[PDB]
Swiss-Prot record, chain B:
It comes from Bos taurus (Bovine). Consists of two distinct domains, a catalytic core and a N-terminal extension that is involved in tRNA binding. Catalyzes the attachment of serine to tRNA(Ser). Is also probably able to aminoacylate tRNA(Sec) with serine, to form the misacylated tRNA L-seryl-tRNA(Sec), which will be further converted into selenocysteinyl-tRNA(Sec). The gene is SARS2. The keyword Ligase applies. This is Serine--tRNA ligase, mitochondrial. Its EC number is 6.1.1.11.
Length: 469, 465
């Protein structure tokens, strides 16, 4: 179905309709069309005129409706004013019986038709307008992913005296990651972390949480299962065709979906509420389990590069009246990501993402790719996006001055630490010839050792039927 | 259909190996034990189950005899042809007699094979619904018959009427549940500030303690196939299931676990561990999801999502080992709750409250002043070989033979109700909440007070103004 969750949500009266800045769009349609085309998303410049026109038609329809409503209360007076005036038996057939009372039922007849038309026009507008992307920062590089601009390169490739191995091989030998023999247990791409592997995840998560909490971020825990409206509000797609979002059985539980990032739950917390101006900027940090269907995306059958479940610590910000505040907060979040990766001793590159890779909600987006020796490639480990007022206008995330005046806040989100790919980068960058893996000083307090070595336990032995004999 | 049987039908694993010889040997003891649990099956069902099993063994013997006779016939034919050395052997009365019996045998087998598959399924579909054995000392009866084994601490004294955790938390803005119906649904919540620090602290305090006591930390998938749940003694298909399943029309056989116990069992499934490593002690922190359709609207006592650190064990050749491990897990739970400064009581759960997989089950209830009663905060169960026989969780003996291991599970710390007990036990008259020394390193304070931020204000259309 093409039913928009934000619109349906509003239709039921659960929240108000999203408040889009049509004044700006109608004032500068040419600029909007050009930026729209450069994103190469669903909607293109050819679609804009129709969207603007539907909005304009709706505005006039509402003007016509109001006009007819006011006129009805004017005709109701042509009768009310005549209940104690010549109301013997004259009014029942006076010259003002027809033409001044028959035009009262004609108005009712019209309004009964216009109200439904208004609803139809309104849905027509939102179904399309809500698929329009956010504006684009003037400095965003134009083009596909390959056009990303390298802003910083930190460190250099680790040098080995042997061919670096992949993280899965390294981990299986140390029995800290397991993916084999799980198709009928937990499915493809699923995995278990054991011993030092689990300690590595706990260490990464706690190192990151500790750092951010110490830096003034408010810790939060959010629901993992959320209604589709929240995803739509964030600029995600609960159900495009192959959808990245897992949904709970609709025949058993109504509208429940697993989030692919704590960003969803965090946005849901602020939905329909206002924060105090004095508290801006609001900085929050949240660790949660993320779920992603990963359909039609990169083929990564083995290894932790594109898994269905993983833990991620998320940074989320709600700020000021405008761009200066949100742009600065994005810069702050990025600097924190760089600090985390630098302290982990990883080689990485910071990228200014191009127009076709911003998505729908992003105005500006900075990603960081970490060098992964075994994979032999730079791989994205974090993303940071300034969504300006795209999410706030859809989910009504406001800020309030001391006086009570409400304005749309801006929202910013950024990866604090996504475990899977950091495990890849760490295991592959710190691997030793003998198969052991050195532990970065920053994580040693969590690992209780400076080197991960072969375990004492005997690895599990498969005793099932599906084996050669 | 039974997920365990289907799983085997597809050849993904062998069929569960139930201890029928023990059952058939002492059907009377099993009969009374079954009735005392007052579960699905009762004494009036054992005779049928035992009969089907016997009919199945006989059918298999009959099939074996026929398959063996078929070979004997084929050999008699080969020997006849070689012995007669004639171009017209087909016309020999004996040759035709053997060939006829050969075709008859094959016909009879075409009848027995389908019957065998049928009986086998009928047996498992019913036999798999039988509970584990029951420990001799288990108290008989319903929950009211739970036996108090020990009590630790004393009820806190207040100079005022203790308030409930939600009121306390909303005032401090550390828990939110209001206006979430269309965001995350009923019985969902957010923890903020000190509230989130409390969860972080509880989880880390428990994880650190257990890791330092020798438990191997683990991370498990949260989405698993139905077979693993069934193997643990849970019910993904009991119509009103407490297990959330991913939309079947989009993704096949994927379910959210209500405890890391499921994933941990899935790890050992179809594998064998070395005897020298027993007992295997693992600890795992995971997000748990429970539909709680049966019953429950406000408060954290019964929610749909929560974080829980789980203890899981795989041990020795028999009962002595699994029993001692359960005791070990219980003692650890008591240490954790005592160090958090909570008042609690240990219970030996009764026959009707063991469920299907448990042989022995100890629960701990913590005093919750605001609630005005004790509430279960942990459970610990010895499942002996109930899960292992269903998921083939083995161990290799000294001699080098495979035997079914025993599994044990226990709550390390379940956050929701611990928050209730902590908030309600340490609340102060002015609304602040004192922090237990053990949790102070994680909270950075000895007292949780009113937050600095201005609480969020609802600005939606559904309000008077
Ligand atoms: N299938 C998968 N397997 C392994 N790692 C994956 C993954 N999908 C995403 N990630 C990791 O999570 C980080 C997040 O995602 P993005 O989805 O880019 O950001 C957001 O979610 C924003 N809320 C900021 O974090 C990525 O940069 C990547 O390292
Ligand atoms: N809906 C809910 N809301 C809040 N807390 C809940 C809950 N369902 C269960 N719990 C908490 O998690 C612990 C777990 O469960 P049980 O299901 O008893 O055990 C097992 O799972 C075994 N694997 C041992 O932990 C319980 O003792 C209880 O404190």
């Amino acid at each position: 179905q093409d039913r928009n969750l934000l619109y349906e949500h509003a239709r039921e009266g659960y929240s108000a309709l999203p408040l889009l800045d049509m004044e700006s769009l109608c004032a500068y349609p040419e600029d909007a069309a050009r930026a729209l085309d450069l994103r190469k998303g669903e909607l293109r410049s050819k679609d804009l005129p129709g969207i603007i026109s539907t909005w304009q038609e709706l505005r006039q329809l509402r003007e016509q409706i109001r006009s007819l409503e006011e006129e009805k209360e004017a005709v109701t007076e042509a009768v009310r004013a005549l209940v104690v005036n010549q109301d013997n038996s004259q009014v029942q057939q006076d010259p003002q019986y027809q033409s001044l009372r028959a035009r009262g039922r004609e108005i009712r007849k019209q309004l009964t038709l216009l109200y439904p038309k208004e609803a139809q026009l309104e849905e027509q507008f939102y179904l399309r307008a809500l698929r329009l992307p956010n504006q684009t920062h003037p400095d965003v590089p134009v083009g596909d992913e390959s056009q990303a601009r390298v802003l910083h390169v930190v460190g250099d490739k680790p040098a080995f005296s042997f061919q670096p191995r992949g993280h899965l091989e390294i981990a299986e030998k140390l029995d800290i990651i397991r993916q084999k023999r799980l198709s009928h247990v937990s499915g493809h791409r699923s995995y278990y972390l054991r011993g030092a592997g689990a300690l590595l995840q706990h260490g990464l998560v706690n190192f990151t949480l500790n750092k951010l909490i110490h830096r003034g971020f408010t810790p939060m825990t959010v629901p993992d299962l959320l209604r589709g409206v929240v995803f739509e509000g964030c600029g995600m797609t609960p159900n495009a065709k192959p959808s990245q979002i897992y949904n709970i059985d609709p025949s058993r539980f109504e509208d429940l979906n697993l989030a692919g990032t704590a960003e969803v739950g965090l946005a849901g917390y602020f939905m329909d509420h206002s924060v105090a101006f004095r508290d801006l900027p609001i900085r929050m940090v949240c660790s949660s389990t993320c779920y992603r269907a990963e359909t039609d995306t990169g083929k990564e059958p083995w290894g932790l590069y594109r898994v269905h479940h993983f833990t991620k610590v998320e940074m989320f910000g709600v700020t000021g009246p405008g761009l200066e505040q949100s742009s600065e907060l994005l810069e702050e979040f990025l600097s924190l990501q760089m600090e985390i990766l630098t302290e982990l001793g990883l080689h990485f590159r910071v990228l200014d993402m191009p127009t076709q890779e911003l998505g729908l909600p992003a105005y500006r987006k900075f990603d960081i790719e970490a060098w992964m020796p075994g994979r032999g490639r730079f791989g994205e480990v974090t993303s940071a996006s300034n969504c300006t007022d795209f999410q706030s206008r859809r989910l009504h995330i406001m800020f309030q001055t001391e006086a009570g005046e409400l304005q749309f806040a801006h929202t910013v989100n950024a990866t604090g630490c996504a475990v899977p790919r950091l495990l890849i980068a760490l295991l592959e960058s710190y691997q030793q010839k003998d198969g052991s893996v050195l532990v970065p000083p920053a994580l040693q307090p969590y690992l209780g050792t400076d080197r991960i070595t072969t375990p004492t336990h005997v690895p599990l032995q498969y005793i099932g039927p599906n084996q050669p004999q």
